[PDB]
Design an enzyme around this catalytic site. Sequence first.
Site, PDB file in Angstrom:
ATOM      1  N   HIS B 104       0.774  -1.247   0.000  1.00  0.00           N
ATOM      2  CA  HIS B 104       0.000   0.000   0.000  1.00  0.00           C
ATOM      3  C   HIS B 104       0.814   1.311   0.000  1.00  0.00           C
ATOM      4  O   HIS B 104       0.203   2.384  -0.028  1.00  0.00           O
ATOM      5  CB  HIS B 104      -1.026   0.013   1.154  1.00  0.00           C
ATOM      6  CG  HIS B 104      -2.377   0.531   0.754  1.00  0.00           C
ATOM      7  ND1 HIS B 104      -3.537  -0.020   1.266  1.00  0.00           N
ATOM      8  CD2 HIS B 104      -2.714   1.509  -0.122  1.00  0.00           C
ATOM      9  CE1 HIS B 104      -4.533   0.649   0.708  1.00  0.00           C
ATOM     10  NE2 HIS B 104      -4.085   1.574  -0.138  1.00  0.00           N
ATOM     11  N   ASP B 126      -9.758  -0.846   3.718  1.00  0.00           N
ATOM     12  CA  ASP B 126      -8.630  -1.496   4.397  1.00  0.00           C
ATOM     13  C   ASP B 126      -9.023  -1.911   5.816  1.00  0.00           C
ATOM     14  O   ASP B 126      -9.858  -1.257   6.446  1.00  0.00           O
ATOM     15  CB  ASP B 126      -7.516  -0.427   4.557  1.00  0.00           C
ATOM     16  CG  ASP B 126      -6.053  -0.805   4.416  1.00  0.00           C
ATOM     17  OD1 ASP B 126      -5.613  -1.818   5.052  1.00  0.00           O
ATOM     18  OD2 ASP B 126      -5.306  -0.026   3.770  1.00  0.00           O
ATOM     19  N   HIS B 128      -6.707  -1.614   7.886  1.00  0.00           N
ATOM     20  CA  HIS B 128      -5.795  -0.620   8.465  1.00  0.00           C
ATOM     21  C   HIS B 128      -6.072   0.831   8.013  1.00  0.00           C
ATOM     22  O   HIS B 128      -6.628   1.048   6.940  1.00  0.00           O
ATOM     23  CB  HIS B 128      -4.362  -1.053   8.171  1.00  0.00           C
ATOM     24  CG  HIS B 128      -4.100  -2.476   8.564  1.00  0.00           C
ATOM     25  ND1 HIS B 128      -4.074  -3.492   7.628  1.00  0.00           N
ATOM     26  CD2 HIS B 128      -3.913  -3.010   9.790  1.00  0.00           C
ATOM     27  CE1 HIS B 128      -3.867  -4.609   8.303  1.00  0.00           C
ATOM     28  NE2 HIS B 128      -3.757  -4.373   9.610  1.00  0.00           N
ATOM     29  N   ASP B 130      -3.680   3.233   7.708  1.00  0.00           N
ATOM     30  CA  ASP B 130      -2.458   3.694   7.030  1.00  0.00           C
ATOM     31  C   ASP B 130      -2.223   5.237   7.161  1.00  0.00           C
ATOM     32  O   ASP B 130      -1.812   5.885   6.192  1.00  0.00           O
ATOM     33  CB  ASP B 130      -2.491   3.245   5.545  1.00  0.00           C
ATOM     34  CG  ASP B 130      -2.665   1.752   5.285  1.00  0.00           C
ATOM     35  OD1 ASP B 130      -2.455   0.950   6.225  1.00  0.00           O
ATOM     36  OD2 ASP B 130      -2.999   1.386   4.134  1.00  0.00           O
ATOM     37  N   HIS B 143       4.128   1.537   4.344  1.00  0.00           N
ATOM     38  CA  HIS B 143       2.792   1.129   3.878  1.00  0.00           C
ATOM     39  C   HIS B 143       1.672   1.486   4.881  1.00  0.00           C
ATOM     40  O   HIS B 143       0.504   1.541   4.492  1.00  0.00           O
ATOM     41  CB  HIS B 143       2.748  -0.354   3.455  1.00  0.00           C
ATOM     42  CG  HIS B 143       2.837  -1.368   4.557  1.00  0.00           C
ATOM     43  ND1 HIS B 143       2.515  -2.698   4.329  1.00  0.00           N
ATOM     44  CD2 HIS B 143       3.231  -1.234   5.846  1.00  0.00           C
ATOM     45  CE1 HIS B 143       2.713  -3.321   5.478  1.00  0.00           C
ATOM     46  NE2 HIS B 143       3.145  -2.482   6.421  1.00  0.00           N
ATOM     47  N   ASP B 234      -7.184  -2.299  -0.319  1.00  0.00           N
ATOM     48  CA  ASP B 234      -6.271  -3.291   0.225  1.00  0.00           C
ATOM     49  C   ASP B 234      -7.064  -4.583   0.358  1.00  0.00           C
ATOM     50  O   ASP B 234      -8.144  -4.577   0.950  1.00  0.00           O
ATOM     51  CB  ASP B 234      -5.746  -2.815   1.596  1.00  0.00           C
ATOM     52  CG  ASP B 234      -4.617  -3.625   2.177  1.00  0.00           C
ATOM     53  OD1 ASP B 234      -4.635  -4.868   2.030  1.00  0.00           O
ATOM     54  OD2 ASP B 234      -3.733  -3.027   2.828  1.00  0.00           O
ATOM     55  N   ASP B 236      -6.630  -6.999   2.312  1.00  0.00           N
ATOM     56  CA  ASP B 236      -6.780  -7.415   3.706  1.00  0.00           C
ATOM     57  C   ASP B 236      -8.019  -6.798   4.388  1.00  0.00           C
ATOM     58  O   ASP B 236      -8.276  -7.138   5.533  1.00  0.00           O
ATOM     59  CB  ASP B 236      -5.484  -7.194   4.526  1.00  0.00           C
ATOM     60  CG  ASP B 236      -5.089  -5.761   4.829  1.00  0.00           C
ATOM     61  OD1 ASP B 236      -5.964  -4.867   4.745  1.00  0.00           O
ATOM     62  OD2 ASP B 236      -3.883  -5.523   5.121  1.00  0.00           O
ATOM     63  N   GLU B 279      -1.620  -5.579  -1.645  1.00  0.00           N
ATOM     64  CA  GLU B 279      -1.269  -6.538  -0.606  1.00  0.00           C
ATOM     65  C   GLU B 279      -1.580  -7.989  -0.962  1.00  0.00           C
ATOM     66  O   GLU B 279      -1.673  -8.826  -0.060  1.00  0.00           O
ATOM     67  CB  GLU B 279      -1.847  -6.139   0.762  1.00  0.00           C
ATOM     68  CG  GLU B 279      -1.478  -4.719   1.190  1.00  0.00           C
ATOM     69  CD  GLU B 279      -0.046  -4.387   1.578  1.00  0.00           C
ATOM     70  OE1 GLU B 279       0.812  -5.298   1.571  1.00  0.00           O
ATOM     71  OE2 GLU B 279       0.220  -3.199   1.874  1.00  0.00           O
TER      72      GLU B 279
END
Lengths: 318, 323, 318
Positions: B104, B126, B128, B130, B143, B234, B236, B279
């Site tokens: 990312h 995501d 996350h 980030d 990332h 992403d 994930d 990812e």
Amino acid sequence: VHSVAVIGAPFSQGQKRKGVEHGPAAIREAGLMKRLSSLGCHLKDFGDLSFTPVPKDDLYNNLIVNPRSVGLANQELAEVVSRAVSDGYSCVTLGGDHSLAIGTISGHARHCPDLCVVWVDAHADINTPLTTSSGNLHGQPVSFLLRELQDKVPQLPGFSWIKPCISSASIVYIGLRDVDPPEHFILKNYDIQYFSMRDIDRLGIQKVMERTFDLLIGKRQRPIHLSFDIDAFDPTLAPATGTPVVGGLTYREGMYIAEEIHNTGLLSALDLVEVNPQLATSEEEAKTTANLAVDVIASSFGQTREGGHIVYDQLPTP
Amino acid sequence: NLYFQSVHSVAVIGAPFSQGQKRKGVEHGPAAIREAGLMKRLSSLGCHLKDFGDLSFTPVPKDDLYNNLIVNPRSVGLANQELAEVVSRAVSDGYSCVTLGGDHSLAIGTISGHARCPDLCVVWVDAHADINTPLTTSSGNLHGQPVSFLLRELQDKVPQLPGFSWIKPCISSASIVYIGLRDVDPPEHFILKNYDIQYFSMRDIDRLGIQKVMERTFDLLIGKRQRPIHLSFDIDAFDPTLAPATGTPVVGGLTYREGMYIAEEIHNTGLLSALDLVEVNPQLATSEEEAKTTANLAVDVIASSFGQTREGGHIVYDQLPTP
Amino acid sequence: VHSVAVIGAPFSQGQKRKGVEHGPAAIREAGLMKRLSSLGCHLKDFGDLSFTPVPKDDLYNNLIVNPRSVGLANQELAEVVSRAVSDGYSCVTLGGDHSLAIGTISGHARHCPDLCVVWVDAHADINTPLTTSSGNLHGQPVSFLLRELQDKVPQLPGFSWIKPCISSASIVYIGLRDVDPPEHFILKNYDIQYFSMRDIDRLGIQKVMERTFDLLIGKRQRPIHLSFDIDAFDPTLAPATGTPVVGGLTYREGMYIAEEIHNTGLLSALDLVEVNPQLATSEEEAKTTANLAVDVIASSFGQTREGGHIVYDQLPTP
Ligand SMILES: N[C@H]1CN[C@@](CCCC[B-](O)(O)O)(C(=O)O)C1
Ligand SMILES: N[C@H]1CN[C@@](CCCC[B-](O)(O)O)(C(=O)O)C1
Ligand SMILES: [Mn+2]
Ligand SMILES: [Mn+2]
Ligand SMILES: [Mn+2]
Ligand SMILES: [Mn+2]
Ligand SMILES: [Mn+2]
Ligand SMILES: [Mn+2]
């Protein structure tokens, strides 16, 4: 900051499947104490209780399994829970089969006259010793605790110490999907509120948690006893359990229940039962179940999806 | 097939970034996505395709880490200045850019190049956020920091890094909306809350439902006026059962249906201007089906972003043959 | 008390993947009959039908594989279904591929001309012999039954006995996620109502079931024909099937559909198709699918997740 007492209850005599006594060891091994410490909880570990066994304790009235051992183990457990609660801790009991709720709820009500219960499970565990088909006491704990059922419950050996301590309007079930015909009668007839998997499918877990709190703490603040059977989760998420039933809670719904209980700030005791690591097909399935048990407990004491537990005050400037 | 509900001009870039993090195998990401059949799929949707191919990246020999934490800062910042130009080229041409990762970290370039329309709005899907600053981060991996450099309100909290001088703050606080958040570090949470950055975590999706989340996201971003959309995605953000071959997998993510829903609603606005698919790590798979599922999933997200739907109807059928 | 007839239709000629002919045995081995008996059903099992083989059966218009075999076997199946329905039985047909719905719906409509169909599937199965790309008759059954499509369906050998028996307003699809461009055209052009996976994501399964019954039984009670393709469920839940498609129904949504069908009290025939035990990567994958097929059928006849299907009105006393 919460004061949290942890009690290990390696007990399996409430059912017939071996290995559920290793559930407290597996949850501890999954890093429970470290996870609670990282949340800022002031911890008191009471260790894993050794239950006084009953050598001569077999089939009663050709139906009830191990009544003397179940009754005795729960009497002992009630004293430890009573001590933890009177010492001002939120009491976490690691099971062990669900018959252990007789002890935890009995010990908790010795200090909280207005306690309410949120029972999260695939099962109602409300058969009486006369309605049970299996005779396994883990499918009967609520019958001994409920005031409205006193005249329907016979006196079992080792059970004379129990006093019913909860009313039908003080317990809410979430996640039901495997209910015996007498249990369905008991829930309906006595107006015990429940949110089965079908109710969750219709309403959604947000409305389920709102209605649960409206029924229990809508009129006044009350200490909450969360009795969480790991088999409330789908068997794909919690395989290491003795009575798995397909179509359970998702990881997200499970965390949501635990988060909403934390948000009341009224959590007083938590049972996390029926983790049986020996029943998993692999070590990773035993670990997955154990890690899920840790996530429920951690979320009940402040672990969140939004990561707002550890309070940040200032960002460093260049 | 000769008839389609819509025709899109789409560009595909293979950016195999690996210096943005420390786990190797994420470079085989654009390769695994292509091997699944991405190009064939976008063609079947009636897309005017412009393949830019798998971009070549050369590592800087003398690349010392900043403040003894930020690992490989020169290589990341240099590659993003150039990736921004390639993305700005396609936008000016009138194309919709699609970047295959890689990690990312490549998002700094794609969002900067895209802004070179200044009234754009971002959708960050995501597990996350980030949004760590180079000083709030703990891992050292870039990332987990792209959004810090791009925000106008975070300029005073972000220092000048080696090869990061070119970045200009383009997007404001009310122009980014997150979806799927479930692993937020304490400094990230402070940023979101204090700078009034609107988001929809897994808990919010649990309460509102994916339909309401998409309705609210557009009410926020494109409610004031029609604006171009940058979908940074992403893999994930999806549950690890669905996307097992990824770097930082967090339990309790988006279902297949929720992710397709996000991508479909994005298509339905008709304002999608740029997209990132990161990812994917084929080296982090315990079986061949686990590697294939994650690649097949990544193709589904991009295809749904340009017309593919559950009901079909993307391909227009004229009349039924008569016996 | 429901009177239920079970018909095994070990049918595979509607497609090219072998093993689907073992679907009825797999469902019976997963405990279908014992489960229906416990619901209080009065059962009649016809066993598995032995369909007359067509050794000389060449492909129609160099595409349609085994037409005569599919047509003849459906003609025989329709006679059996028609008889069971005449004798007052709710007819459960175990597949076999989804081409068997030609025979079950044809047979059912002879005595129930006002029937409505709830088609639960990842696919619309509405290609005509002129739009099909595979040439697999299991992807075309609805084209032969739909009144409004008669002028678009050529006369196939062994298919002349078929009299179109359903109108576009009397069929509702649930679960659609793998629809061919000519099928999407038919659905829109002939105003056939459907609830794809995207409609379910938006409305939720409760609203989907309410809207379905509003369309079908909003004006009057009608016999319901539930045509359930196991591939409507997500492949993780129903792996042992020929055409799996990711992002399907959850176990909970599938049970919800069946429970709602049961609640109408109008279920007159049910098809449970596309269970192929040979396509399972492991013995447990085949059993998971077969157990799922039993749960759908049981839920359609009264099985609940709340446990209220069995009469229980008085507690035993000590
Ligand atoms: N049909 C089920 C419902 N009632 C059962 C419960 C056993 C599981 C109880 B537990 O996991 O919650 O502990 C019974 O034996 O009474 C069988
Ligand atoms: N693209 C798909 C849609 N149409 C298909 C359907 C085959 C599955 C039929 B069944 O499982 O529902 O029985 C076709 O071959 O016509 C392929
Ligand atoms: Mn229990
Ligand atoms: Mn249970
Ligand atoms: Mn990311
Ligand atoms: Mn991520
Ligand atoms: Mn079908
Ligand atoms: Mn199908």
